[PDB]
């Protein structure tokens, strides 16, 4: 549950956790391409908050 912040507090951290560790798996795997880092950039700013 994110992008609108009153969801955040409804992220389940097994399930971010986990597409996180895929999507970095995924961007080594593939030669890191601009669109994989993008989406891990934004995770990434979900658990920063700000």
């Known amino acids: 549950s994110l992008y609108p ?3 955040q507090k ?3 951290p097994d399930v ?3 597409i996180v560790k895929i999507l970095h798996d ?3 795997e593939k030669e890191k391409p ?3 880092f993008e989406i891990l950039q934004r ?3 979900l ?3 700000d």
């Open 47 to 49: 658990k920063r908050f």
């Open 5 to 7: 912040k009153l969801f």
């Open 43 to 45: 995770l990434s700013e």
């Open 26 to 28: 995924f961007y080594i």
């Open 16 to 18: 971010f956790n986990q």
């Open 34 to 36: 601009l669109l994989i």
């Open 10 to 12: 409804n992220l389940d």
